[PDB]
């Protein structure tokens, strides 16, 4: 994040804001990113993977010089973001299953 | 026509510039001290209120007020020579306009940063039957963009490869007009700029491994086609082979950020030699490039004061 | 993949390709989050840290449909130049999990 934010500030800084504005409104939307199965404890948790049209640059003779390095930095940012995402949701699922088991133990003991 | 009548206003504009100590004092502020220092600056007359986009719009309007008049009030061969100074912004505007025309988005969706032509012509060129008709709508007498569009227009109607060949032919037409002009300094400045752009393209195409002969251009004096192939390959010794040229410190640098920083430093050093000809047009282009470097540095200082960047984070940006 | 993080620095996320929205008002950002969980914006929403600590409670209220739109607290940029307090974030995540102030 520190890498990508410093590169984005410096890239909109040395060039204009309008050049990176039109560039960012020109980039294809990078769609088809979706979530597939991690069925474990009998519970499908959705892990996330993308599709990444990345190497097909938008007419790769590009006149700004700090848009592409910033875009590679933000693709690394999206890499680390989906890794934190599919670790964080799995941690949440296992924590709520611990809460389920714990309330089931206490209920079953102290009632039946 | 008169290379000195515009040079008088150029010297009057060069008398009104910020010192290096004004940027040195901007290394320790809180964007309110920077706003107060901008209020004392010559660019502060367009300063409306407070905020980063307001400061950016004020800097853009100040650059248009201080540099945009030099494209006007010129005549003949002097006008044709001074037209090849503020050409990158109009080229980027036309490139993203052709991309939007091939995309189909709204004409008000584009930003259209300021160039050298009328904005109503760019509005009328949003809807056109042919790209040759759009070029004829955007046709100026001495602008090389119209002739370059007429030359490269005999490939297709509108392609991305057509846009890439249009940019390559725009650089080639800038080099051809520099060869076709009577100015001993601006020709070498544009040739060094084209060679640095070719080296930057060789850095930006590293890892692709495709045919560099299509990627390389013509017009440079410090680089070779075999040197371009060695730069396309992973051979930094060829970057070490640039001995005696303006790429003196540029040697063995694999970082593309440091490569572009050294390229901008070499370009600013070459443009700093533009004060040698006090009667031509190179001093005006030197003042324009100095105002552009100062404006880029002001935008960098504004971004640093906005998001709290350290002085060590901007120490690699104030070397020249 | 969508973000609601910043007024202008979300343009860098758009420059990555992945779509998004920015409003710098909490309720229009949450309303575009609402039409983004109705029209599911491809399973990931990254929300600013120091604007929404817990984005998930209102979204699971207004959509008890499943957690295909994943919601993350993504870092603000300015606070990113301070220090993440990774330790304290995991403290509040573990206390959101089991309530205990137990420290791994």
């Amino acid at each position: 994040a520190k890498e990508a934010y410093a590169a984005l500030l410096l890239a909109q800084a040395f060039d204009g804001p309008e050049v990176v504005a039109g560039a960012a409104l020109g980039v294809p939307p990078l769609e088809g990113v979706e979530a597939e199965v991690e069925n474990v404890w009998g519970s499908k948790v959705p892990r996330l993977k993308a599709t990444f049209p990345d190497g097909a640059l938008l007419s790769p003779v590009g006149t700004p010089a700090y848009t592409l390095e910033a875009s590679r930095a933000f693709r690394r940012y999206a890499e680390a973001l989906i890794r934190v995402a599919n670790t964080e949701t799995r941690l949440k699922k296992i924590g709520e299953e611990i809460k389920k088991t714990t309330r089931r133990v206490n209920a079953l003991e102290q009632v039946v | 026509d008169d290379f000195a009548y515009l040079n008088a206003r150029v010297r009057v504009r060069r008398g009104t510039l910020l010192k290096e100590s004004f940027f040195q004092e901007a290394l320790d502020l809180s964007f309110a001290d920077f706003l107060r220092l901008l209020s004392e600056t010559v660019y502060g007359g367009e300063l409306a209120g407070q905020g980063l986009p307001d400061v950016d719009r004020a800097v853009l309007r100040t650059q248009a007020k201080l540099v945009g008049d030099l494209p006007r009030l010129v005549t003949g061969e002097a006008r044709e020579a001074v037209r090849l100074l503020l050409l990158r912004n109009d080229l980027h505007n036309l490139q993203a306009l052709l991309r939007a025309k091939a995309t189909g988005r709204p004409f008000e969706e584009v930003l259209l940063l300021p160039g050298t032509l009328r904005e109503e012509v760019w509005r009328q060129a949003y809807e056109a039957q042919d790209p040759a008709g759009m070029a004829q709508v955007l046709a100026v007498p001495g602008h090389p963009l119209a002739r370059a569009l007429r030359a490269v227009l005999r490939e297709t109607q509108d392609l991305a490869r057509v846009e890439a060949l249009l940019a390559k032919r725009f650089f080639e037409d800038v080099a051809k007009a520099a060869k076709g002009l009577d100015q001993p300094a601006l020709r070498d400045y544009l040739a060094l700029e084209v060679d640095a752009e070719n080296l930057r393209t060789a850095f930006k195409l590293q890892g692709s491994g495709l045919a560099p002969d299509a990627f390389f251009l013509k017009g440079g004096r410090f680089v070779d086609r075999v040197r371009f192939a060695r730069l396309m390959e992973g051979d930094y010794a060829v970057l070490d082979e640039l001995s005696g040229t303006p790429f003196s410190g540029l040697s063995g640098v694999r970082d593309l950020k440091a490569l572009e920083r050294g390229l901008r430093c070499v370009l600013l050093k070459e443009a700093k030699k533009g004060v040698q000809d006090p009667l031509g047009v190179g001093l005006v282009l030197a003042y324009v490039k100095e105002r552009e470097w100062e404006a880029v540095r002001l935008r960098l200082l504004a971004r640093r004061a906005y998001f709290g960047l350290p002085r060590a984070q901007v120490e690699e940006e104030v070397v020249c | 993949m969508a973000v609601i993080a910043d007024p202008e620095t979300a343009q860098g996320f758009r420059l990555a390709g992945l779509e998004g929205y920015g409003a710098s008002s909490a309720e229009e950002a949450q309303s575009l989050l609402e039409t983004l969980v109705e029209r599911g914006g491809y399973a990931l929403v990254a929300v600013d840290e120091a604007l929404l600590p817990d984005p998930e409670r209102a979204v699971e209220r207004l959509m008890r449909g499943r957690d295909l739109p994943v919601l993350l607290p993504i870092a603000g940029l300015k606070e990113a130049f301070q220090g993440h307090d990774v330790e304290g974030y995991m403290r509040e995540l573990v206390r959101k999990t089991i309530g205990f102030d137990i420290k791994l």
Side-chain angles (χ1 to χ4, degrees), chain A, chain B residues 4 8 15 26 32 44-45 48-49 51 53 58 64 68 71 76 78 81 96 100 102 104 106 114-115 125 128 131-133 135 139 141-142 144 146 148 151 160 164 167 175 177-178 180 184-185 191 196 202 207 209 211-212 214 219-220 229 234 237 244 246 249 252 258 262 271 274 278 280 282 286 295 302 305 308 310 312, chain C:
Chain A
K2 292 179 177 65
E3 294 177 354
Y5 283 120
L8 191 275
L9 289 173
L10 189 143
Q12 70 186 359
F14 284 161
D15 297 335
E18 291 85 4
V19 287
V20 297
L25 271 70
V27 173
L30 199 144
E31 291 181 353
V33 50
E34 61 94 13
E36 64 180 1
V37 187
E38 283 290 327
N39 193 1
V40 66
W41 289 269
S43 67
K44 175 184 179 294
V45 291
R47 74 174 189 270
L48 277 75
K49 84 281 195 183
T51 57
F52 283 156
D54 52 357
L57 303 178
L58 293 176
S59 68
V61 182
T63 54
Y66 285 158
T67 58
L68 272 304
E69 188 174 3
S71 180
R72 292 176 182 175
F74 279 107
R75 288 182 179 92
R76 295 294 299 162
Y77 191 84
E79 289 286 332
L81 184 61
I82 58 96
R83 297 294 182 184
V84 175
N86 62 4
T87 300
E88 195 271 339
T89 182
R90 187 176 301 167
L91 190 145
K92 283 179 92 285
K93 184 69 172 67
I94 299 303
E96 299 297 327
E97 190 69 28
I98 290 175
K99 188 180 289 292
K100 178 180 290 294
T101 289
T102 301
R103 69 183 175 179
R104 186 172 181 174
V105 170
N106 284 317
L108 192 145
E109 184 175 2
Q110 298 296 319
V111 175
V112 301
Chain C
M1 187 180 291
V3 294
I4 39 171
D6 287 325
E8 199 273 331
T9 321
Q11 299 298 321
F13 294 160
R14 296 184 183 180
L15 186 146
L18 53 95
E19 60 187 1
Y21 187 80
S24 179
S25 68
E27 295 297 322
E28 190 178 2
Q30 286 169 354
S31 299
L32 270 298
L33 180 58
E34 176 63 30
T35 190
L36 185 62
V37 300
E38 292 293 329
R39 186 261 183 190
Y42 291 152
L44 186 59
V45 177
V47 189
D48 186 75
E49 277 181 350
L51 186 63
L52 279 77
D54 289 334
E56 295 181 353
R57 295 179 65 87
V59 178
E60 65 91 19
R61 176 63 181 86
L62 277 79
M63 182 178 177
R64 294 188 186 275
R66 298 281 79 79
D67 200 74
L68 179 64
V70 188
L71 301 173
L72 273 75
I74 199 166
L77 71 161
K78 179 75 172 182
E79 194 267 332
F81 291 102
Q82 299 298 108
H84 185 77
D85 68 17
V86 181
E87 293 180 354
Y89 180 74
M90 285 297 171
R91 297 296 183 271
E92 69 92 18
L93 185 61
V94 169
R95 191 175 179 180
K96 188 176 175 68
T97 299
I98 60 171
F100 293 153
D101 198 358
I102 52 99
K103 294 180 178 174
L104 202 284

